[PDB]
Each structure stands twice: as C-alpha cells, then as structure tokens.
C-alpha cells in the first residue's frame, strides 16, 4: 500500500512490511528474510 499508510520495517526503514513469517507468526519484511533474522523461516507474501 501507499507510503504513509503501509508500516515500514524497523530494521529496514525503506522496506514495507510485506511478508508474514509463518515460523515466528509475525509480519516482517523481505529483506529480513533474505539477509536478516528470518533467513531460516517459512514465510508467505501478505499480498497486494
């Protein structure tokens, strides 16, 4: 969604929260999955 409405990652300030970590049960960002703390996790797109 639009900037100003879409929550941004605390770790990656320029990345929208755009995925869901199924392993951790938290929404998070794709950079956290590629390079960060959710690298080992099962994740899914939030969508849209």
Residues annotated in a binding site for Zn(2+)? 9, 12, 32, 38
What are the two backbone dihedrals, phi and then psi, of residue 23, each rounded to the nearest 5 degrees?
Answer: -70, -45
Q: Is 7 within 8 Å of 1 (Cβ atoms)?
A: no
Q: Does 8 bind Zn ion (CB under 5 A)?
A: no
Give the whole-angstrom CA distance, residue 21 versus residue 30. 10
Q: Does 17 bind Zn ion (CB under 5 A)?
A: no
Applying CB under 5 A, which residues contact Zn ion?
9, 11-12, 21, 23-24, 29, 31-32, 38, 41
Applying CB under 8 A, which residues contact a copy of itself?
14-16, 18-19, 29-31, 33-35, 43, 45, 48
């Amino acid at each position: 969604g639009a900037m100003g409405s879409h929550p941004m990652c605390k770790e990656h300030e320029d990345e929208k929260i755009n995925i869901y970590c199924l392993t951790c049960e938290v929404p998070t960002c794709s950079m956290c999955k590629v390079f960060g703390i959710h690298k080992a996790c099962e994740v899914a797109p939030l969508q849209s």
